[PDB]
Every structure is written in C-alpha cells, then in structure tokens.
Amino acid sequence: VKQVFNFNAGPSALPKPALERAQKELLNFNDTQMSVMELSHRSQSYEEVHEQAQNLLRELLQIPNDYQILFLQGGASLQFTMLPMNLLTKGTIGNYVLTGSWSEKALKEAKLLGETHIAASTKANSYQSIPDFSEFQLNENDAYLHITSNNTIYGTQYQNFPEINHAPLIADMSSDILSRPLKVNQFGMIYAGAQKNLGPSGVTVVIVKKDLLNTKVEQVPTMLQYATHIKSDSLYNTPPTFSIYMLRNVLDWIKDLGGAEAIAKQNEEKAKIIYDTIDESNGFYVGHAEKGSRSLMNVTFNLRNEELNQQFLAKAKEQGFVGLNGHRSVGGCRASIYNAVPIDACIALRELMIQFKENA
Amino acid sequence: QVFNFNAGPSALPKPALERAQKELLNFNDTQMSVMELSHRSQSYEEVHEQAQNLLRELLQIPNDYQILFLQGGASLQFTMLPMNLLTKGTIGNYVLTGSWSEKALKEAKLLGETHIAASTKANSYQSIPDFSEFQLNENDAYLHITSNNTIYGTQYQNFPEINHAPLIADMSSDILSRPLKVNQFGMIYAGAQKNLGPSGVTVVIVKKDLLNTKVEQVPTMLQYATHIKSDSLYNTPPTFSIYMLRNVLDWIKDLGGAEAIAKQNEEKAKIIYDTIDESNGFYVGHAEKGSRSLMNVTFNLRNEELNQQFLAKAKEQGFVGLNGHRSVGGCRASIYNAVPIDACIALRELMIQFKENA
Numbered sequence: 033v034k035q036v037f038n039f040n041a042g043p044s045a046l047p048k049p050a051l052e053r054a055q056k057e058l059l060n061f062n063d064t065q066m067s068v069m070e071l072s073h074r075s076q077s078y079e080e081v082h083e084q085a086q087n088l089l090r091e092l093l094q095i096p097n098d099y100q101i102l103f104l105q106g107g108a109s110l111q112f113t114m115l116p117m118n119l120l121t122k123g124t125i126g127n128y129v130l131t132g133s134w135s136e137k138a139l140k141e142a143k144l145l146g147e148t149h150i151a152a153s154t155k156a157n158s159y160q161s162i163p164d165f166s167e168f169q170l171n172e173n174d175a176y177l178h179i180t181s182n183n184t185i186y187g188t189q190y191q192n193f194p195e196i197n198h199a200p201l202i203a204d205m206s207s208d209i210l211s212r213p214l215k216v217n218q219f220g221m222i223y224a225g226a227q228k229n230l231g232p233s234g235v236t237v238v239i240v241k242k243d244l245l246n247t248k249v250e251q252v253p254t255m256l257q258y259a260t261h262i263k264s265d266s267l268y269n270t271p272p273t274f275s276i277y278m279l280r281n282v283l284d285w286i287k288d289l290g291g292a293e294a295i296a297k298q299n300e301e302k303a304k305i306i307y308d309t310i311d312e313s314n315g316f317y318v319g320h321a322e323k324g325s326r327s328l329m330n331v332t333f334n335l336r337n338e339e340l341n342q343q344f345l346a347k348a349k350e351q352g353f354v355g356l357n358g359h360r361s362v363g364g365c366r367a368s369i370y371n372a373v374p375i376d377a378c379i380a381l382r383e384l385m386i387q388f389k390e391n392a
Numbered sequence: 393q394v395f396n397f398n399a400g401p402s403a404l405p406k407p408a409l410e411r412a413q414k415e416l417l418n419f420n421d422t423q424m425s426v427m428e429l430s431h432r433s434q435s436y437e438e439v440h441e442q443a444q445n446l447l448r449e450l451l452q453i454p455n456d457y458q459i460l461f462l463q464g465g466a467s468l469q470f471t472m473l474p475m476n477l478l479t480k481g482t483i484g485n486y487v488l489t490g491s492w493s494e495k496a497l498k499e500a501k502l503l504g505e506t507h508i509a510a511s512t513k514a515n516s517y518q519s520i521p522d523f524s525e526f527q528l529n530e531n532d533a534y535l536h537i538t539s540n541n542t543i544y545g546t547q548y549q550n551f552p553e554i555n556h557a558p559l560i561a562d563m564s565s566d567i568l569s570r571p572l573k574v575n576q577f578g579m580i581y582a583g584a585q586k587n588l589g590p591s592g593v594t595v596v597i598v599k600k601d602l603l604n605t606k607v608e609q610v611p612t613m614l615q616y617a618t619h620i621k622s623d624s625l626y627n628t629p630p631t632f633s634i635y636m637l638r639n640v641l642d643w644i645k646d647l648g649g650a651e652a653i654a655k656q657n658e659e660k661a662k663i664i665y666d667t668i669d670e671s672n673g674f675y676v677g678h679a680e681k682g683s684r685s686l687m688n689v690t691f692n693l694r695n696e697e698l699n700q701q702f703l704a705k706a707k708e709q710g711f712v713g714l715n716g717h718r719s720v721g722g723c724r725a726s727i728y729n730a731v732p733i734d735a736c737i738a739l740r741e742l743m744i745q746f747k748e749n750a
C-alpha cells in the first residue's frame with residue numbers, strides 16, 4: 033500500500049468529513065429512506081439541500097443580497113461561451129485580461145460571438161506574472177472586462193483585484209474561489225467549476241449580480257440564458273443533485289473549520305512550505321511564476337531538464353503522490369494545493385523534493 | 393414503508409448504491425474516492441471506457457456509433473442538436489407526442505426552420521401517431537421524436553424507418569428499458585436520471601459520420617465534433633455521475649440485460665394497468681391502451697376532489713412522487729427499471745383500498 037498525497041488539479045482532494053458524511057447517508061438521506069441521488073429535484077427534501085448550499089456559500093463569502101447563486105452544468109468551459117452570449121451585444125466589446133491558458137480559452141469563445149479586445153496580457157512574459165492594472169486598456173463600449181483570478185496551468189494568481197466601474201468585472205475563479213475572503217461587490221459575475229475548491233465535478237457555481245443578467249436575451253437558447261436560471265433558481269431543468277449535495281457538505285466543512293479567513297491561513301502556510309523548498313534549492317527546482325504573482329493554489333515548477341523532471345515524477349508516483357505532473361500543455365510539475373489538500377501532504381512533498389535533490 | 397415512484401431523478405438499484413457506498417472512500421484500491429480522481433488519470437479513464445463498453449454491449453450499439461457523456465441534461469440537447477444539424481436551407485422536423493417534444497421543437501425554432509411531421513396534441517397527447525401520417529420534407533435536417541412521453545404516459549412501441557434524414561430520439565425516460573435497434577437512429581440522447589443512474593450526465597449515442605465534422609460558428613462546447621474527437625474528455629466530465637452510470641449498467645448486465653429488464657418492466661406495468669382497467673372507470677388512464685408507456689403510468693380519478701384525496705392518502709402511506717407533473721396534474725406512477733415490482737404491488741393495493749373506502 034502507498035500513502036496518498038493528492039495534488040490533483042481538478043477534480044481534486046475532498047475533505048474527509050464531507051466524504052464520510054456522504055458515505056454514511058448514501059442509502060438513506062435525512063430519514064427519507066432514499067439516497068439524495070433518488071430524490072426529485074421538485075421535492076422539498078431536495079430543495080432544502082439546494083437552498084442550504086446557496087446559503088452556506090452566501091455566509092462564507094459574504095455575498096450581498098443583490099447577488100444570486102446559480103448552480104449550472106457544463107463546467108467553467110460552458111461559461112466561456114454563455115457569458116458573451118448573454119452580454120456581448122452588437123456595438124459592445126468583450127474585453128479580456130490574458131494571464132494564462134484558461135484566459136485564452138475564454139477569449140476564444142467570445143471571438144466567435146462578437147468583437148473582443150485584450151486589455152492587458154503577460155503572454156509575452158510567458159504568463160509568469162499578473163499585469164499591472166495601470167496597463168489595462170479599457171473601452172467605453174466594453175460589455176465587460178474578464179479576468180482569470182487564478183491561472184491554474186501557469187501557477188499565477190491575482191493578489192488583489194482591479195477597481196472597475198466602467199463596465200461589469202467578470203472573473204473565472206475556478207481554481208481559487210473560496211480559498212480566501214473575497215469582496216464580491218467588486219464583480220458583476222464570478223464563475224467556477226466546483227471540482228477544484230467547492231466539491232466534485234458536475235456543477236459550476238455562478239455568483240451573479242441579479243440586475244446585470246436577469247433579462248432575457250433575444251435569440252439565445254433557453255438553457256444558455258442566465259435569466260432562465262435566475263428566474264428558476266437553478267431549477268429550470270434537472271440540476272446535478274448529488275454534486276450540489278456534495279458542495280453543501282464541503283461548504284459545511286469550510287464553515288466548521290472557521291470559514292474563509294481560517295482556510296486562507298492554512299492555504300498560505302501550505303504554499304509557503306513548497307515555495308520555500310523551491311527558493312532554497314539553489315535552482316534545482318525553478319518556479320514558473322514570478323514571486324510577486326505566485327499562486328497559493330497551484331505551484332508550478334521544473335527541474336533542470338526533462339530527464340530530471342521525469343525521474344522526479346516517477347519517484348513521486350512510486351511514493352504515493354498523485355497528480356504532480358504539470359498540465360500536459362506545459363509539462364513540468366504542478367502541485368495543486370486547494371483547500372482540502374492537507375498541509376501534511378505539502379510536508380511530504382517537501383521531503384520528497386529534498387531527498388530527490390540530495391540523491392541526484 | 394417508502395415506495396419511490398419519482399419521475400427523475402428516481403429509484404436506483406440497491407446493488408449499485410451499495411457498491412458506491414462501500415468504496416466511496418477507497419475506489420479500486422487507490423485510497424481515494426472516485427470523486428477525487430483526475431479525469432486525466434488512468435484510474436478514471438478506465439471507468440469512463442467501461443461505462444461506454446457496457447452500454448455498447450447492452451444495447452448492441454454498432455461499431456459506427458460513438459457514445460458521448462455530456463453535461464446539461466436532455467434540455468441542452470434540445471438546442472445542441474439543431475445548432476449542429478439545422479443549417480440554412482434545411483428543416484428541423486418534429487413529431488409531437490407530448491410536452492418534452494414541444495420543448496425540443498421550441499429550441500429548434502430559435503435556430504432555423506421547423507416543421508411538424510405529425511402531432512397528437514389535438515388528441516391531448518393520448519397516443520402515438522401512425523407513422524403513415526408523417527409529413528417528411530426533402531430538405532429535412534433530421535426527424536426528431538420523443539420515445540417515451542414522460543409527462544403524458546405514452547410510448548412508441550416501435551420506431552419509424554427514416555433514411556432521407558437522420559432520425560433523432562429523446563429517449564430520456566425509456567433508454568435501456570428494452571432492446572433497441574440503434575441503427576434506426578442518427579442520434580439518441582437521454583438524461584441519465586430516469587433509467588441509467590443519477591442526474592448530471594446525459595448519454596448521447598451518435599452515428600459518428602453524421603456529427604464528427606466541425607460546424608462553423610458553433611461554440612466549441614456545443615459542437616458534437618469536439619466531444620467525439622475528445623472521447624467526452626474535452627473538458628472535465630461529471631466523473632461521479634459516469635461512475636454511477638457504470639454501476640447501474642453492471643446491475644442491468646448482471647440481471648440478464650435488456651431482454652431480462654424488458655420482461656420485468658412488462659410484468660410490473662401490468663400490475664398497475666390491470667388495476668386501472670378493472671376499476672369500472674374509478675381510475676382512468678390518460679394513454680390510449682395501444683400507446684401505453686411501460687415507464688410512466690398516468691391516470692386520474694373521476695374529478696379533482698378524488699385526485700386530491702387519493703394523492704394525500706398515498707403520501708400518508710409512504711408513496712413518493714405519485715403526483716402528476718405540475719404541467720398536467722393527475723397521477724403519475726414512474727416505474728423505471730429499478731422500481732421494484734413490490735412497489736407496484738403496493739400501489740395496486742393502495743388503489744384497491746382507496747376505491748373501496750370511497
């Protein structure tokens with residue numbers, strides 16, 4: 033048997049209490065004698081779980097009342113197209129800040145639907161940094177300005193957010209939502225696939241300023257209108273009921289541990305273990321990110337050559353590390369250290385790194 | 393003391409749920425949950441492929457069809473289909489046999505020209521139209537049907553021979569309830585939560601050469617070609633839902649497959665329909681007898697006071713989900729593959745006792 037150190041990038045490690053709770057009641061949820069998986073989405077029993085998940089997110093992120101929490105299917109990827117479908121109208125511009133591959137994927141879908149613009153980009157700096165907000169090129173007819181808060185593939189992250197008042201600020205927060213407190217009122221819309229930091233795959237969380245998106249859009253398919261899901265409270269069609277249930281369990285765990293401030297402290301400590309190991313390695317491990325733009329959620333690094341990368345990753349696999357290979361598009365290594373990844377897995381990664389360097 | 397007649401999501405096979413429970417924290421000796429695996433891992437890829445292979449075996453899906461696992465429900469397919477096939481100068485042709493048929497047509501109308509090949513709307517969706525009635529156009533992009541009209545309780549007994557354009561079927565509420573000649577279709581889709589497991593995955597069986605070409609101007613996530621080329625791993629799939637689907641398909645396989653399940657479904661439907669038919673009009677089925685669904689049994693008592701009394705008694709006695717869909721009222725006993733015959737018997741007994749006490 034191998035120990036498990038789960039550095040998977042999404043889906044990812046879950047809190048053991050959330051899983052254990054799910055296991056215990058999998059056949060009989062809340063004395064109904066049915067699994068949560070067997071309930072109608074039109075039942076009170078399910079509605080209670082759906083509402084509880086929203087209310088927990090609201091409490092934990094301090095979401096103001098004029099925002100609504102949607103639970104959608106399709107991943108963050110579907111949001112790449114649904115956002116411009118809803119807001120990118122003739123005469124306006126979808127303005128994007130490019131800070132990684134996920135930013136590019138979002139921009140690509142907007143280009144199919146309307147005029148786009150690049151407000152700022154660190155592509156020429158190999159996505160090693162977040163641009164200075166003073167670099168942002170904005171347009172009066174921007175439909176929105178879109179950012180990617182945590183650039184999962186490159187391991188960079190916004191340390192704080194721009195103050196934008198000329199157009200709605202929109203963020204793909206898939207890989208750092210609820211890793212720390214967040215001033216939601218800075219944004220018109222936030223979206224996140226749940227499978228990094230909120231739960232399992234199969235549901236996408238969208239926090240939307242209601243008045244921004246609660247109007248039907250001409251000619252847009254029913255399922256692709258935010259208004260449909262706003263009006264229907266994410267019950268227009270059949271939701272991913274078990275995913276939402278698991279989201280509820282994960283949010284309860286975050287609340288039990290002390291909320292967003294407590295998890296931020298844990299995440300900062302975890303990240304420091306790994307970054308100090310990189311920095312103290314005299315170049316044996318080299319981080320992709322510039323220090324000032326380092327992600328607390330995905331730590332990306334390389335050894336001095338591909339042969340060493342491969343040897344390191346093979347050793348890691350032998351020793352029980354899961355998911356440490358970088359995203360296939362970039363190679364290297366990526367330690368994903370979302371909320372539920374335990375600090376002791378980070379300690380183990382440090383030990384592996386120190387030993388590998390000494391035995392090289 | 394609970395009888396689960398929910399219409400979707402719905403009852404699951406006990407062995408599939410027990411299996412999931414047992415290994416929820418330690419899937420296949422990995423010491424993690426299936427929910428904690430990367431979709432880019434061999435461990436998950438094996439489950440993904442096994443689910444496909446089980447479906448392929450159980451429905452005898454030919455080699456020239458591919459099995460996709462998508463998000464969005466059957467409802468997203470209502471728009472994704474015409475986005476991919478309803479091109480300028482062609483027609484999305486629909487057979488209307490219920491509410492779900494109308495919802496599919498509505499989405500196509502947003503995207504191009506449509507046509508009604510046949511409809512039983514004027515007969516209150518009490519029947520499936522004779523195929524001889526179908527009006528077909530040389531420029532049809534496809535002909536779309538709904539195999540089981542979940543809200544109205546009617547069901548195609550067999551399927552039309554359509555070769556001028558691909559036949560497309562929303563089989564959400566009866567997929568894998570019986571054997572199917574898949575080669576009659578260009579595409580079959582089904583939300584999993586009626587008969588294949590839990591919500592959050594939609595199964596799409598597609599003739600590969602029909603839909604494997606990129607369609608200009610369609611968003612990447614909404615092209616079938618994206619998912620075909622990527623084997624439903626373009627973006628992150630609903631991994632737990634696909635795992636559960638695998639478990640349910642294994643249960644179907646273990647009891648003898650689609651013929652065995654059809655036999656069980658016919659037996660348990662008979663219990664309810666015989667109860668209706670012997671009631672001297674006290675219970676009246678919505679469907680014409682020759683169009684009766686084996687998956688959703690719809691009926692009413694003689695008036696709304698009696699409907700309410702019956703449904704209240706049912707609730708008191710532990711029956712879940714018998715109220716008709718909110719769009720039509722009355723009663724609906726959903727009797728998908730995993731609903732046990734003993735629940736159908738309990739429903740019969742409830743119905744007989746209620747009439748006796750009325």
Ligand SMILES: [Cl-]
Pocket residue numbers: 131132133134135182183184185186187
């Ligand atoms: Cl990225």
Ligand SMILES: [Cl-]
Pocket residue numbers: 489490491492493540541542543544545
């Ligand atoms: Cl229907």
Ligand code: NA
Pocket residue numbers: 268269
């Ligand atoms: Na509906």
Ligand code: NA
Pocket residue numbers: 304307308309311
């Ligand atoms: Na450091």
Ligand code: NA
Pocket residue numbers: 626627
């Ligand atoms: Na990708």
